[PDB]
Protein backbone atom coordinates (compact mmCIF):
# COMPACT_ATOMS: atom_id res chain seq x y z
CA UNK A 1 0.00 0.00 0.00
CA UNK A 2 2.90 2.33 0.76
CA UNK A 3 4.42 1.30 -2.57
CA UNK A 4 1.24 2.60 -4.18
CA UNK A 5 1.37 5.75 -2.04
CA UNK A 6 4.95 6.38 -3.12
CA UNK A 7 3.92 5.37 -6.66
CA UNK A 8 6.59 2.67 -6.60
CA UNK A 9 5.83 -0.33 -8.80
CA UNK A 10 9.06 -2.29 -9.28
CA UNK A 11 8.58 -3.46 -5.68
CA UNK A 12 4.77 -3.39 -5.63
CA UNK A 13 4.84 -6.61 -7.61
CA UNK A 14 7.75 -8.08 -5.63
CA UNK A 15 6.42 -7.30 -2.16
CA UNK A 16 2.89 -7.98 -3.41
CA UNK A 17 3.82 -11.46 -4.63
CA UNK A 18 3.66 -12.68 -1.02
CA UNK A 19 -0.03 -11.76 -0.54
CA UNK A 20 -1.97 -13.04 -3.55
CA UNK A 21 -0.71 -16.52 -2.65
CA UNK A 22 -3.10 -16.13 0.30
CA UNK A 23 -6.82 -16.30 -0.35
CA UNK A 24 -8.27 -13.54 1.84
CA UNK A 25 -5.88 -10.67 1.08
CA UNK A 26 -6.02 -11.39 -2.67
CA UNK A 27 -9.32 -9.58 -3.16
CA UNK A 28 -8.17 -6.87 -0.76
CA UNK A 29 -5.19 -6.07 -2.97
CA UNK A 30 -7.45 -6.20 -6.04
CA UNK A 31 -9.77 -3.67 -4.40
CA UNK A 32 -6.77 -1.54 -3.47
CA UNK A 33 -5.63 -1.45 -7.12
CA UNK A 34 -8.97 -1.11 -8.95
CA UNK A 35 -9.40 2.47 -7.73
CA UNK A 36 -5.72 3.22 -8.46
CA UNK A 37 -5.85 2.21 -12.13
CA UNK A 38 -2.42 0.57 -12.42
CA UNK A 39 -3.81 -2.44 -14.26
CA UNK A 40 -0.67 -2.84 -16.38
CA UNK A 41 1.25 -3.45 -13.16
CA UNK A 42 -1.67 -5.46 -11.77
CA UNK A 43 -1.69 -7.92 -14.67
CA UNK A 44 2.08 -8.31 -14.92
CA UNK A 45 2.04 -8.78 -11.14
CA UNK A 46 -0.40 -11.64 -11.69
CA UNK A 47 1.48 -12.81 -14.78
CA UNK A 48 3.92 -14.24 -12.23
CA UNK A 49 0.98 -16.19 -10.76
CA UNK A 50 2.08 -19.10 -12.95
CA UNK A 51 5.59 -18.83 -11.55
CA UNK A 52 4.68 -19.99 -8.06
CA UNK A 53 4.42 -22.98 -5.74
CA UNK A 54 1.24 -22.18 -3.76
CA UNK A 55 -1.07 -20.32 -6.15
CA UNK A 56 -4.76 -21.13 -5.77
CA UNK A 57 -7.94 -20.98 -7.82
CA UNK A 58 -9.27 -17.51 -6.99
CA UNK A 59 -6.11 -15.94 -8.40
CA UNK A 60 -6.63 -17.31 -11.90
CA UNK A 61 -10.40 -16.82 -11.54
CA UNK A 62 -10.14 -13.07 -11.05
CA UNK A 63 -7.24 -12.92 -13.53
CA UNK A 64 -9.20 -14.51 -16.36
CA UNK A 65 -12.06 -12.17 -15.47
CA UNK A 66 -9.63 -9.25 -15.76
CA UNK A 67 -8.75 -10.53 -19.23
CA UNK A 68 -12.50 -10.68 -19.82
CA UNK A 69 -12.65 -6.95 -18.99
CA UNK A 70 -9.18 -5.44 -19.58
CA UNK A 71 -7.52 -7.58 -22.30
CA UNK A 72 -9.97 -9.86 -24.14
CA UNK A 73 -7.19 -10.35 -26.71
CA UNK A 74 -5.51 -12.60 -24.11
CA UNK A 75 -8.42 -14.41 -22.43
CA UNK A 76 -8.71 -17.44 -24.71
CA UNK A 77 -5.17 -18.71 -24.17
CA UNK A 78 -4.94 -18.07 -20.41
CA UNK A 79 -8.36 -19.70 -20.13
CA UNK A 80 -7.10 -22.69 -22.13
CA UNK A 81 -4.74 -23.73 -19.31
CA UNK A 82 -6.38 -23.25 -15.92
CA UNK A 83 -9.94 -24.12 -16.93
CA UNK A 84 -9.37 -27.21 -14.79
CA UNK A 85 -8.20 -25.21 -11.77
CA UNK A 86 -10.55 -22.26 -12.17
CA UNK A 87 -14.04 -22.06 -10.67
CA UNK A 88 -17.05 -22.02 -12.98
CA UNK A 89 -19.59 -19.54 -11.54
CA UNK A 90 -17.40 -16.53 -10.77
CA UNK A 91 -16.00 -16.50 -14.32
CA UNK A 92 -18.86 -17.56 -16.59
CA UNK A 93 -21.07 -14.78 -15.25
CA UNK A 94 -18.42 -12.07 -15.57
CA UNK A 95 -17.66 -13.22 -19.12
CA UNK A 96 -21.38 -13.15 -19.89
CA UNK A 97 -21.34 -9.53 -18.71
CA UNK A 98 -18.59 -8.99 -21.30
CA UNK A 99 -20.64 -10.77 -24.01
CA UNK A 100 -17.73 -12.96 -25.12
CA UNK A 101 -19.62 -15.75 -26.84
CA UNK A 102 -16.75 -17.71 -28.41
CA UNK A 103 -15.41 -18.68 -24.95
CA UNK A 104 -18.48 -19.17 -22.76
CA UNK A 105 -19.42 -21.91 -25.25
CA UNK A 106 -15.92 -23.37 -25.00
CA UNK A 107 -16.12 -23.52 -21.21
CA UNK A 108 -19.61 -25.02 -21.25
CA UNK A 109 -18.05 -27.65 -23.50
CA UNK A 110 -15.19 -28.09 -21.03
CA UNK A 111 -17.60 -28.28 -18.08
CA UNK A 112 -20.11 -30.16 -20.33
CA UNK A 113 -22.85 -27.59 -19.73
CA UNK A 114 -24.56 -28.48 -22.99
CA UNK A 115 -27.88 -26.92 -21.99
CA UNK A 116 -26.01 -23.70 -21.22
CA UNK A 117 -23.93 -24.14 -24.39
CA UNK A 118 -26.57 -24.68 -27.07
CA UNK A 119 -28.76 -21.82 -25.84
CA UNK A 120 -25.78 -19.47 -26.01
CA UNK A 121 -24.82 -20.77 -29.45
CA UNK A 122 -28.37 -20.17 -30.67
CA UNK A 123 -28.84 -16.67 -29.26
CA UNK A 124 -25.27 -15.75 -30.36
CA UNK A 125 -24.26 -17.95 -33.32
CA UNK A 126 -22.27 -15.19 -35.06
CA UNK A 127 -19.05 -16.69 -33.66
CA UNK A 128 -19.98 -19.44 -31.17
CA UNK A 129 -21.64 -21.57 -33.87
CA UNK A 130 -19.94 -24.54 -35.51
CA UNK A 131 -21.48 -27.23 -37.70
CA UNK A 132 -19.65 -30.14 -36.05
CA UNK A 133 -19.42 -29.03 -32.45
CA UNK A 134 -23.18 -28.54 -32.45
CA UNK A 135 -23.68 -31.82 -34.31
CA UNK A 136 -21.95 -33.81 -31.57
CA UNK A 137 -23.01 -31.70 -28.57
CA UNK A 138 -26.70 -32.15 -29.43
CA UNK A 139 -26.78 -35.83 -28.47
CA UNK A 140 -25.59 -35.19 -24.89
CA UNK A 141 -28.20 -32.52 -24.08
CA UNK A 142 -30.80 -33.12 -21.37
CA UNK A 143 -33.70 -30.87 -22.43
CA UNK A 144 -34.90 -32.62 -25.57
CA UNK A 145 -37.45 -29.95 -26.54
CA UNK A 146 -34.48 -27.84 -27.67
CA UNK A 147 -34.16 -30.30 -30.57
CA UNK A 148 -37.23 -28.76 -32.21
CA UNK A 149 -36.06 -25.19 -31.61
CA UNK A 150 -32.61 -25.92 -33.02
CA UNK A 151 -34.38 -27.39 -36.04
CA UNK A 152 -36.28 -24.10 -36.25
CA UNK A 153 -32.95 -22.26 -36.11
CA UNK A 154 -31.39 -24.33 -38.89
CA UNK A 155 -34.51 -24.05 -41.04
CA UNK A 156 -34.08 -20.31 -40.58
CA UNK A 157 -30.35 -20.63 -41.39
CA UNK A 158 -29.13 -23.97 -42.85
CA UNK A 159 -31.94 -26.00 -44.46
CA UNK A 160 -29.55 -28.40 -46.20
CA UNK A 161 -28.04 -29.32 -42.83
CA UNK A 162 -31.48 -30.24 -41.47
CA UNK A 163 -31.34 -33.71 -43.03
CA UNK A 164 -27.75 -34.15 -41.82
CA UNK A 165 -28.67 -33.17 -38.26
CA UNK A 166 -31.82 -35.29 -38.51
CA UNK A 167 -29.65 -38.36 -39.14
CA UNK A 168 -28.27 -37.97 -35.61
CA UNK A 169 -31.45 -36.58 -34.02
CA UNK A 170 -33.79 -39.41 -35.13
CA UNK A 171 -33.08 -41.67 -32.10
CA UNK A 172 -33.58 -39.03 -29.39
CA UNK A 173 -36.38 -37.27 -31.31
CA UNK A 174 -39.96 -37.95 -32.33
CA UNK A 175 -40.81 -39.06 -35.85
CA UNK A 176 -44.37 -37.70 -35.70
CA UNK A 177 -43.71 -34.26 -34.19
CA UNK A 178 -40.99 -33.78 -36.81
CA UNK A 179 -43.33 -34.31 -39.77
CA UNK A 180 -45.92 -32.17 -37.99
CA UNK A 181 -43.38 -29.35 -37.80
CA UNK A 182 -42.51 -29.80 -41.47
CA UNK A 183 -46.17 -29.74 -42.51
CA UNK A 184 -46.73 -26.73 -40.24
CA UNK A 185 -44.11 -24.58 -42.01
CA UNK A 186 -44.62 -26.70 -45.17
CA UNK A 187 -41.15 -28.19 -45.72
CA UNK A 188 -42.10 -31.82 -46.29
CA UNK A 189 -40.41 -32.44 -49.69
CA UNK A 190 -37.18 -31.05 -48.23
CA UNK A 191 -36.92 -34.15 -45.99
CA UNK A 192 -38.26 -36.61 -48.59
CA UNK A 193 -35.02 -38.69 -48.75
CA UNK A 194 -34.88 -39.25 -44.99
CA UNK A 195 -38.50 -40.34 -44.48
CA UNK A 196 -37.83 -43.54 -46.46
CA UNK A 197 -35.90 -44.84 -43.41
CA UNK A 198 -38.77 -44.56 -40.88
CA UNK A 199 -41.65 -46.39 -42.59
CA UNK A 200 -40.27 -49.37 -40.67
CA UNK A 201 -41.65 -47.54 -37.63
CA UNK A 202 -44.87 -47.11 -39.66
CA UNK A 203 -46.20 -44.09 -37.80
CA UNK A 204 -49.52 -42.97 -39.27
CA UNK A 205 -48.27 -39.50 -40.20
CA UNK A 206 -45.18 -41.18 -41.64
CA UNK A 207 -47.31 -43.90 -43.27
CA UNK A 208 -49.45 -41.42 -45.21
CA UNK A 209 -47.07 -38.49 -45.85
CA UNK A 210 -44.57 -40.52 -47.88
CA UNK A 211 -47.52 -42.09 -49.70
CA UNK A 212 -48.78 -38.62 -50.61
CA UNK A 213 -45.26 -37.91 -51.87
CA UNK A 214 -45.35 -41.07 -54.00
CA UNK A 215 -48.68 -39.89 -55.43
CA UNK A 216 -46.82 -36.75 -56.57
CA UNK A 217 -44.12 -38.96 -58.14
CA UNK B 1 -26.63 -62.42 -40.64
CA UNK B 2 -23.20 -63.84 -39.84
CA UNK B 3 -20.07 -61.78 -40.49
CA UNK B 4 -19.13 -64.21 -43.26
CA UNK B 5 -22.25 -63.39 -45.29
CA UNK B 6 -21.90 -59.60 -45.24
CA UNK B 7 -18.15 -59.67 -45.83
CA UNK B 8 -18.39 -62.22 -48.65
CA UNK B 9 -21.11 -60.28 -50.47
CA UNK B 10 -19.45 -56.87 -49.93
CA UNK B 11 -16.78 -57.64 -52.53
CA UNK B 12 -19.32 -58.78 -55.12
CA UNK B 13 -21.44 -55.70 -54.37
CA UNK B 14 -18.44 -53.41 -54.83
CA UNK B 15 -17.50 -55.19 -58.05
CA UNK B 16 -21.12 -54.62 -59.08
CA UNK B 17 -20.59 -50.99 -58.01
CA UNK B 18 -23.65 -50.61 -55.79
CA UNK B 19 -22.11 -48.44 -53.10
CA UNK B 20 -25.51 -47.57 -51.67
CA UNK B 21 -26.15 -51.26 -51.01
CA UNK B 22 -22.55 -52.10 -50.09
CA UNK B 23 -22.47 -49.18 -47.64
CA UNK B 24 -25.28 -50.51 -45.46
CA UNK B 25 -24.12 -54.07 -46.17
CA UNK B 26 -20.64 -53.36 -44.75
CA UNK B 27 -21.69 -51.70 -41.50
CA UNK B 28 -21.90 -55.17 -39.94
CA UNK B 29 -18.21 -55.76 -40.82
CA UNK B 30 -16.51 -52.49 -39.82
CA UNK B 31 -17.70 -53.17 -36.26
CA UNK B 32 -15.22 -56.08 -36.17
CA UNK B 33 -11.68 -54.74 -35.78
CA UNK B 34 -10.42 -58.09 -37.09
CA UNK B 35 -12.45 -57.46 -40.30
CA UNK B 36 -11.90 -53.72 -40.92
CA UNK B 37 -8.35 -53.40 -42.24
CA UNK B 38 -9.04 -56.12 -44.81
CA UNK B 39 -11.97 -54.08 -46.14
CA UNK B 40 -9.92 -50.89 -46.32
CA UNK B 41 -7.22 -52.84 -48.16
CA UNK B 42 -9.82 -54.06 -50.64
CA UNK B 43 -11.20 -50.55 -51.11
CA UNK B 44 -7.93 -48.66 -51.61
CA UNK B 45 -7.34 -50.88 -54.65
CA UNK B 46 -10.76 -49.78 -55.87
CA UNK B 47 -9.87 -46.21 -54.93
CA UNK B 48 -13.43 -45.50 -53.76
CA UNK B 49 -12.28 -43.33 -50.85
CA UNK B 50 -15.00 -40.69 -51.31
CA UNK B 51 -17.56 -43.52 -51.24
CA UNK B 52 -16.33 -45.34 -48.12
CA UNK B 53 -15.80 -42.24 -45.97
CA UNK B 54 -19.59 -41.97 -45.87
CA UNK B 55 -19.74 -45.53 -44.54
CA UNK B 56 -17.18 -44.56 -41.92
CA UNK B 57 -19.20 -41.48 -40.96
CA UNK B 58 -22.10 -43.91 -40.55
CA UNK B 59 -19.92 -46.22 -38.43
CA UNK B 60 -19.90 -43.63 -35.64
CA UNK B 61 -23.62 -44.27 -35.19
CA UNK B 62 -23.01 -48.01 -34.86
CA UNK B 63 -23.13 -49.26 -31.28
CA UNK B 64 -19.74 -50.99 -31.65
CA UNK B 65 -17.82 -47.75 -32.24
CA UNK B 66 -14.37 -49.12 -31.38
CA UNK B 67 -10.90 -47.62 -31.77
CA UNK B 68 -9.55 -49.11 -35.02
CA UNK B 69 -12.53 -47.60 -36.82
CA UNK B 70 -11.39 -44.16 -35.70
CA UNK B 71 -7.75 -44.94 -36.52
CA UNK B 72 -8.64 -45.77 -40.12
CA UNK B 73 -11.00 -42.79 -40.30
CA UNK B 74 -8.23 -40.43 -39.18
CA UNK B 75 -5.71 -42.18 -41.44
CA UNK B 76 -7.83 -41.39 -44.48
CA UNK B 77 -8.83 -37.91 -43.27
CA UNK B 78 -5.10 -37.21 -42.88
CA UNK B 79 -4.25 -37.10 -46.60
CA UNK B 80 -7.43 -37.62 -48.64
CA UNK B 81 -9.19 -34.87 -46.67
CA UNK B 82 -6.39 -33.21 -44.66
CA UNK B 83 -8.43 -30.11 -43.82
CA UNK B 84 -10.79 -32.42 -41.88
CA UNK B 85 -8.14 -34.28 -39.86
CA UNK B 86 -7.67 -31.72 -37.08
CA UNK B 87 -11.38 -30.99 -36.72
CA UNK B 88 -12.42 -34.65 -36.64
CA UNK B 89 -9.57 -35.36 -34.20
CA UNK B 90 -10.69 -32.72 -31.70
CA UNK B 91 -12.94 -35.48 -30.28
CA UNK B 92 -11.63 -39.03 -30.74
CA UNK B 93 -8.10 -38.24 -29.52
CA UNK B 94 -9.14 -40.04 -26.32
CA UNK B 95 -10.61 -42.83 -28.48
CA UNK B 96 -7.99 -43.59 -31.15
CA UNK B 97 -4.68 -45.43 -31.42
CA UNK B 98 -1.78 -43.06 -30.79
CA UNK B 99 1.32 -44.53 -32.49
CA UNK B 100 -0.29 -45.96 -35.61
CA UNK B 101 -1.94 -42.60 -36.27
CA UNK B 102 1.31 -40.80 -35.46
CA UNK B 103 3.39 -42.74 -37.99
CA UNK B 104 0.44 -42.64 -40.39
CA UNK B 105 0.28 -38.86 -40.00
CA UNK B 106 4.01 -38.71 -40.81
CA UNK B 107 3.11 -38.82 -44.52
CA UNK B 108 1.13 -35.58 -44.59
CA UNK B 109 2.98 -34.56 -41.38
CA UNK B 110 0.70 -31.60 -40.85
CA UNK B 111 2.84 -30.53 -37.95
CA UNK B 112 0.14 -28.54 -36.15
CA UNK B 113 -1.99 -31.65 -35.65
CA UNK B 114 0.99 -33.68 -34.45
CA UNK B 115 2.00 -30.94 -32.01
CA UNK B 116 -1.51 -30.57 -30.59
CA UNK B 117 -1.80 -34.36 -30.40
CA UNK B 118 1.48 -34.81 -28.51
CA UNK B 119 0.38 -31.97 -26.23
CA UNK B 120 -2.81 -33.88 -25.46
CA UNK B 121 -1.06 -37.19 -24.70
CA UNK B 122 1.55 -35.52 -22.43
CA UNK B 123 4.41 -36.64 -24.73
CA UNK B 124 5.60 -33.06 -24.69
CA UNK B 125 9.21 -33.80 -25.70
CA UNK B 126 8.16 -34.90 -29.18
CA UNK B 127 6.03 -31.77 -29.49
CA UNK B 128 9.06 -29.66 -28.62
CA UNK B 129 11.10 -31.25 -31.42
CA UNK B 130 8.19 -30.92 -33.84
CA UNK B 131 7.80 -27.24 -32.99
CA UNK B 132 11.59 -26.89 -33.28
CA UNK B 133 12.01 -28.31 -36.79
CA UNK B 134 8.76 -27.17 -38.49
CA UNK B 135 7.62 -24.01 -36.68
CA UNK B 136 6.31 -22.04 -39.66
CA UNK B 137 3.02 -23.97 -39.59
CA UNK B 138 3.27 -25.48 -36.07
CA UNK B 139 4.35 -23.01 -33.40
CA UNK B 140 2.67 -20.87 -30.75
CA UNK B 141 4.28 -18.40 -28.37
CA UNK B 142 1.81 -19.20 -25.61
CA UNK B 143 1.84 -22.96 -25.13
CA UNK B 144 5.56 -23.30 -25.90
CA UNK B 145 6.30 -21.24 -22.77
CA UNK B 146 4.73 -23.73 -20.35
CA UNK B 147 4.89 -27.06 -22.19
CA UNK B 148 8.68 -26.63 -22.15
CA UNK B 149 8.60 -26.80 -18.34
Amino acid sequence: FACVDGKEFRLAQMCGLHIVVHADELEELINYYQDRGYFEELITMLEAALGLERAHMGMFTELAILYSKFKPQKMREHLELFWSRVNIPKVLRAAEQAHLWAELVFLYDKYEEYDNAIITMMNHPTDAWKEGQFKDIITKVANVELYYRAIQFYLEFKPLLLNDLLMVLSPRLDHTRAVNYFSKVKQLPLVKPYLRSVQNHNNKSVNESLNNLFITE
Amino acid sequence: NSTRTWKEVCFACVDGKEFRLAQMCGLHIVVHADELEELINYYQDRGYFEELITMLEAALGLERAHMGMFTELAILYSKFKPQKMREHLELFWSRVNIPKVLRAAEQAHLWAELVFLYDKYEEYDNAIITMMNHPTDAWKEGQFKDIIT
Binding site: - | T3, E63, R64, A65, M67, G68, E122, E123, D125
Partner: protein
Protein backbone atom coordinates in the same frame (compact mmCIF):
# COMPACT_ATOMS: atom_id res chain seq x y z
CA UNK C 1 -30.72 -79.65 -21.70
CA UNK C 2 -26.94 -79.88 -22.05
CA UNK C 3 -27.29 -79.63 -25.84
CA UNK C 4 -29.13 -76.29 -25.53
CA UNK C 5 -26.31 -74.05 -26.88
CA UNK C 6 -25.54 -76.42 -29.78
CA UNK C 7 -29.12 -76.77 -31.00
CA UNK C 8 -29.55 -73.04 -30.33
CA UNK C 9 -26.65 -72.33 -32.67
CA UNK C 10 -28.42 -74.52 -35.20
CA UNK C 11 -31.63 -72.60 -34.49
CA UNK C 12 -29.96 -69.27 -35.17
CA UNK C 13 -28.65 -70.81 -38.38
CA UNK C 14 -32.34 -71.34 -39.15
CA UNK C 15 -32.68 -67.61 -38.28
CA UNK C 16 -35.79 -67.65 -36.06
CA UNK C 17 -37.08 -65.02 -33.67
CA UNK C 18 -35.25 -63.92 -30.53
CA UNK C 19 -38.11 -63.78 -28.00
CA UNK C 20 -38.55 -67.54 -28.45
CA UNK C 21 -34.98 -67.93 -27.21
CA UNK C 22 -35.46 -65.39 -24.43
CA UNK C 23 -38.42 -67.43 -23.20
CA UNK C 24 -36.72 -70.81 -23.60
CA UNK C 25 -33.61 -69.77 -21.67
CA UNK C 26 -35.83 -69.23 -18.61
CA UNK C 27 -36.81 -72.92 -18.61
CA UNK C 28 -35.51 -74.78 -15.57
CA UNK C 29 -32.15 -76.04 -16.77
CA UNK C 30 -30.30 -79.03 -15.39
CA UNK C 31 -26.76 -80.03 -16.26
CA UNK C 32 -25.59 -77.13 -18.40
CA UNK C 33 -22.49 -75.48 -19.86
CA UNK C 34 -22.23 -71.72 -19.32
CA UNK C 35 -18.83 -70.58 -20.63
CA UNK C 36 -19.47 -71.74 -24.23
CA UNK C 37 -22.98 -70.57 -25.06
CA UNK C 38 -21.17 -67.22 -25.10
CA UNK C 39 -18.76 -68.59 -27.72
CA UNK C 40 -21.78 -69.85 -29.65
CA UNK C 41 -23.70 -66.56 -29.70
CA UNK C 42 -20.42 -64.75 -30.46
CA UNK C 43 -20.63 -66.22 -33.96
CA UNK C 44 -24.29 -65.19 -34.06
CA UNK C 45 -23.43 -61.74 -32.66
CA UNK C 46 -26.56 -61.40 -30.52
CA UNK C 47 -25.13 -61.34 -27.00
CA UNK C 48 -27.78 -58.79 -25.99
CA UNK C 49 -30.14 -61.78 -26.15
CA UNK C 50 -28.47 -63.06 -22.96
CA UNK C 51 -28.83 -59.90 -20.84
CA UNK C 52 -31.98 -60.69 -18.78
CA UNK C 53 -31.19 -64.27 -17.82
CA UNK C 54 -27.64 -63.45 -16.76
CA UNK C 55 -28.92 -60.35 -14.97
CA UNK C 56 -31.16 -62.54 -12.83
CA UNK C 57 -28.33 -65.06 -12.47
CA UNK C 58 -26.01 -62.43 -11.02
CA UNK C 59 -28.91 -61.10 -8.94
CA UNK C 60 -28.81 -64.52 -7.32
CA UNK C 61 -25.10 -63.77 -6.88
CA UNK C 62 -23.26 -66.57 -8.66
CA UNK C 63 -19.48 -66.17 -8.54
CA UNK C 64 -18.84 -67.73 -11.96
CA UNK C 65 -16.21 -66.17 -14.26
CA UNK C 66 -18.12 -67.71 -17.18
CA UNK C 67 -20.93 -65.19 -16.54
CA UNK C 68 -19.04 -62.35 -14.88
CA UNK C 69 -16.79 -62.04 -17.95
CA UNK C 70 -19.66 -62.18 -20.45
CA UNK C 71 -21.43 -59.39 -18.58
CA UNK C 72 -18.31 -57.27 -19.07
CA UNK C 73 -18.06 -58.22 -22.74
CA UNK C 74 -21.62 -57.13 -23.47
CA UNK C 75 -21.07 -54.01 -21.37
CA UNK C 76 -18.15 -53.20 -23.68
CA UNK C 77 -20.23 -53.54 -26.85
CA UNK C 78 -22.91 -51.36 -25.19
CA UNK C 79 -20.91 -48.27 -26.28
CA UNK C 80 -20.96 -47.28 -22.59
CA UNK C 81 -18.07 -46.84 -20.12
CA UNK C 82 -17.90 -50.02 -17.96
CA UNK C 83 -14.71 -49.05 -16.12
CA UNK C 84 -16.20 -49.17 -12.62
CA UNK C 85 -18.04 -52.45 -13.17
CA UNK C 86 -14.65 -53.68 -14.35
CA UNK C 87 -12.98 -52.48 -11.14
CA UNK C 88 -15.67 -53.42 -8.58
CA UNK C 89 -16.56 -56.94 -9.81
CA UNK C 90 -14.19 -59.31 -7.91
CA UNK C 91 -15.42 -62.44 -9.72
CA UNK C 92 -14.47 -62.31 -13.41
CA UNK C 93 -11.03 -62.99 -14.87
CA UNK C 94 -8.64 -60.32 -16.13
CA UNK C 95 -7.15 -62.39 -18.96
CA UNK C 96 -10.21 -62.82 -21.18
CA UNK C 97 -11.32 -59.22 -20.77
CA UNK C 98 -7.78 -58.05 -21.52
CA UNK C 99 -7.35 -60.05 -24.70
CA UNK C 100 -10.91 -59.05 -25.63
CA UNK C 101 -10.38 -55.38 -24.74
CA UNK C 102 -6.92 -55.42 -26.35
CA UNK C 103 -7.82 -53.58 -29.56
CA UNK C 104 -11.29 -52.31 -28.67
CA UNK C 105 -10.16 -50.41 -25.57
CA UNK C 106 -6.73 -50.85 -23.95
CA UNK C 107 -7.69 -48.09 -21.50
CA UNK C 108 -9.95 -50.68 -19.82
CA UNK C 109 -7.74 -53.71 -20.44
CA UNK C 110 -4.96 -52.01 -18.48
CA UNK C 111 -7.28 -51.61 -15.50
CA UNK C 112 -8.29 -55.25 -15.87
CA UNK C 113 -4.64 -56.25 -15.71
CA UNK C 114 -4.09 -53.75 -12.87
CA UNK C 115 -6.55 -55.36 -10.49
CA UNK C 116 -5.77 -58.78 -11.97
CA UNK C 117 -2.04 -58.10 -11.46
CA UNK C 118 -1.35 -59.15 -15.07
CA UNK C 119 1.84 -57.13 -15.22
CA UNK C 120 3.38 -59.09 -18.08
CA UNK C 121 0.26 -58.68 -20.20
CA UNK C 122 0.14 -55.01 -19.19
CA UNK C 123 3.59 -54.54 -20.70
CA UNK C 124 2.60 -56.84 -23.58
CA UNK C 125 -0.17 -54.40 -24.61
CA UNK C 126 0.09 -51.06 -22.83
CA UNK C 127 3.76 -50.69 -23.75
CA UNK C 128 2.88 -51.39 -27.38
CA UNK C 129 0.08 -48.86 -27.88
CA UNK C 130 -1.16 -46.84 -24.90
CA UNK C 131 -0.53 -43.93 -22.60
CA UNK C 132 2.49 -45.22 -20.68
CA UNK C 133 1.64 -42.85 -17.81
CA UNK C 134 -0.96 -45.33 -16.56
CA UNK C 135 1.74 -47.99 -16.59
CA UNK C 136 4.10 -45.86 -14.51
CA UNK C 137 1.22 -45.12 -12.15
CA UNK C 138 0.71 -48.86 -11.71
CA UNK C 139 4.37 -49.73 -11.16
CA UNK C 140 4.97 -46.92 -8.69
CA UNK C 141 1.69 -47.94 -7.05
CA UNK C 142 2.46 -51.67 -7.24
CA UNK C 143 6.04 -51.16 -6.09
CA UNK C 144 7.93 -54.22 -7.33
CA UNK C 145 11.71 -54.19 -7.98
CA UNK C 146 11.62 -57.33 -10.12
CA UNK C 147 9.22 -55.58 -12.51
CA UNK C 148 11.67 -52.71 -12.98
CA UNK C 149 14.40 -55.28 -13.50
CA UNK C 150 12.37 -57.07 -16.18
CA UNK C 151 11.67 -53.76 -17.89
CA UNK C 152 14.96 -51.89 -17.33
CA UNK C 153 17.44 -54.06 -19.23
CA UNK C 154 17.62 -52.38 -22.69
CA UNK C 155 15.73 -55.12 -24.53
CA UNK C 156 12.48 -53.17 -24.74
CA UNK C 157 12.64 -50.43 -27.42
CA UNK C 158 9.84 -48.47 -25.69
CA UNK C 159 11.70 -47.62 -22.46
CA UNK C 160 12.58 -43.99 -23.28
CA UNK C 161 8.95 -42.78 -23.48
CA UNK C 162 7.83 -44.44 -20.25
CA UNK C 163 10.82 -43.04 -18.36
CA UNK C 164 10.22 -39.63 -19.99
CA UNK C 165 6.72 -39.95 -18.49
CA UNK C 166 7.48 -41.39 -15.03
CA UNK C 167 9.89 -38.52 -14.42
CA UNK C 168 6.68 -36.46 -14.16
CA UNK C 169 4.31 -39.05 -12.70
CA UNK C 170 6.54 -39.71 -9.67
Amino acid sequence: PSRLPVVIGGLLDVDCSEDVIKNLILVVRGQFSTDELVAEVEKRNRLKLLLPWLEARIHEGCEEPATHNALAKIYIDSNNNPERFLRENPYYDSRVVGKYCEKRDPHLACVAYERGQCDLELINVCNENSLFKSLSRYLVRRKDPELWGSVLLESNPYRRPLIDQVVQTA
